[PDB]
Amino acid sequence: DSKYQCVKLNDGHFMPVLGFGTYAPAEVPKSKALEAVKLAIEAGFHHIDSAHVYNNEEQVGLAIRSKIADGSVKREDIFYTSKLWSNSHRPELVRPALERSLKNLQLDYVDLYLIHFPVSVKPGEEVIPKDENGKILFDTVDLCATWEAMEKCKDAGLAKSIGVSNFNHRLLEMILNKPGLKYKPVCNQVECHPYFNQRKLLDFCKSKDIVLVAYSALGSHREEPWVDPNSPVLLEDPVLCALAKKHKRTPALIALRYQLQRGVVVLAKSYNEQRIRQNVQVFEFQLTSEEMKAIDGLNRNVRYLTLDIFAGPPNYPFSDEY
Numbered sequence: 001d002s003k004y005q006c007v008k009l010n011d012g013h014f015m016p017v018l019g020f021g022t023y024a025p026a027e028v029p030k031s032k033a034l035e036a037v038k039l040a041i042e043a044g045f046h047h048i049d050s051a052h053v054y055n056n057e058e059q060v061g062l063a064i065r066s067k068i069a070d071g072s073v074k075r076e077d078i079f080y081t082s083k084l085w086s087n088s089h090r091p092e093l094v095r096p097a098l099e100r101s102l103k104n105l106q107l108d109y110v111d112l113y114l115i116h117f118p119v120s121v122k123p124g125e126e127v128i129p130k131d132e133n134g135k136i137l138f139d140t141v142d143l144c145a146t147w148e149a150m151e152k153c154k155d156a157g158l159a160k161s162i163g164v165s166n167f168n169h170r171l172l173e174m175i176l177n178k179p180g181l182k183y184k185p186v187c188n189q190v191e192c193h194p195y196f197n198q199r200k201l202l203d204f205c206k207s208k209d210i211v212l213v214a215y216s217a218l219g220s221h222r223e224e225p226w227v228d229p230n231s232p233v234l235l236e237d238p239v240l241c242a243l244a245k246k247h248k249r250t251p252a253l254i255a256l257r258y259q260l261q262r263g264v265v266v267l268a269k270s271y272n273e274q275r276i277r278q279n280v281q282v283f284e285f286q287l288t289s290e291e292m293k294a295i296d297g298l299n300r301n302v303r304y305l306t307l308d309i310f311a312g313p314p315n316y317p318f319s320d321e322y
């Protein structure tokens with residue numbers, strides 16, 4: 001249809017509340033990203049989420065360009081998000097990174113550009129640069145300077161809105177309390193699901209009118225060594241399955257709806273045609289206050305993606321309570 005559910009960002013732009021995630025483990029051919037995004041748009045997704053580090057923007061861009069060129073959708077009805085990887089946190093390297101992504105995508109602008117992760121690494125083509133002894137080559141960069149460069153990208157029209165990802169309370173306050181701040185981040189994309197519902201960070205973001213965008217909302221890709229294979233399987237949870245049976249939906253759908261009813265914009269990744277179409281069903285039903293509370297009770301406070309290889313530097317975001 002021509003209309004769909006969106007929320008107003010603090011900069012006046014609108015973000016579709018259901019986004020399609022495009023990250024897929026290395027073993028998965030990039031060609032799959034192309035097919036998956038086209039199906040997502042066909043199914044009704046109007047929000048597509050990617051990043052330079054996913055190494056799929058050429059494919060994701062083609063999918064978008066294809067669905068626009070054949071009349072399926074208009075550019076203004078696609079909300080595309082990219083992210084600035086950590087090897088380009090230095091002010092002077094921010095715009096070149098966005099322009100590189102745009103060249104790969106063959107798009108004129110991105111609807112949203114995020115600082116992907118708060119820990120910086122040395123400049124260069126390598127996303128995770130290491131010295132001869134395997135040590136990650138960390139870099140010292142003032143994120144407030146990185147943000148000013150992000151703001152300039154917005155003023156240049158290259159990015160409609162700018163936000164962050166994997167930022168904690170301290171880091172957000174740092175950007176928000178920054179002298180001469182021109183644009184607040186429109187969002188903070190972080191891991192969020194029933195086992196880690198981010199209640200505290202969520203309320204903080206709400207008090208500043210920052211949209212919290214949940215990733216790994218279905219339990220994550222569970223790809224090693226990024227995620228502990230011993231971690232509980234979210235969609236297998238008994239309460240979610242009970243609710244699924246009750247509503248005649250699926251555990252995945254219950255988990256996605258949960259986020260939508262607590263004011264959270266949710267992402268959902270899937271390269272399976274049937275599950276892709278299934279996910280848009282999140283707009284076909286609603287959960288009661290009691291069901292919502294039952295899901296709140298599932299919080300385990302255990303994080304799936306710690307990205308500890310980036311632990312050590314002061315900016316590592318997951319040490320603080322939130």
Ligand SMILES: NC(=O)C1=CN([C@@H]2O[C@H](COP(=O)(O)OP(=O)(O)OC[C@H]3O[C@@H](n4cnc5c(N)ncnc54)[C@H](OP(=O)(O)O)[C@@H]3O)[C@@H](O)[C@H]2O)C=CC1
Pocket residue numbers: 020021022023024049050116165166189214215216217218219220221235250252253267268269270271272275276278279305
């Ligand atoms: N900014 C950041 O730091 C990060 C952002 N992300 C973003 O979040 C997105 C989603 O995260 P992850 O990638 O963590 O994905 P999700 O947690 O959304 O999905 C996990 C798994 O759910 C399966 N699934 C999808 N739909 C259903 C369904 N209806 N029923 C049962 N299983 C289902 C998928 O399998 P299948 O494909 O076989 O259907 C997929 O492997 C990414 O693609 C990326 O865009 C991810 C990590 C970090």
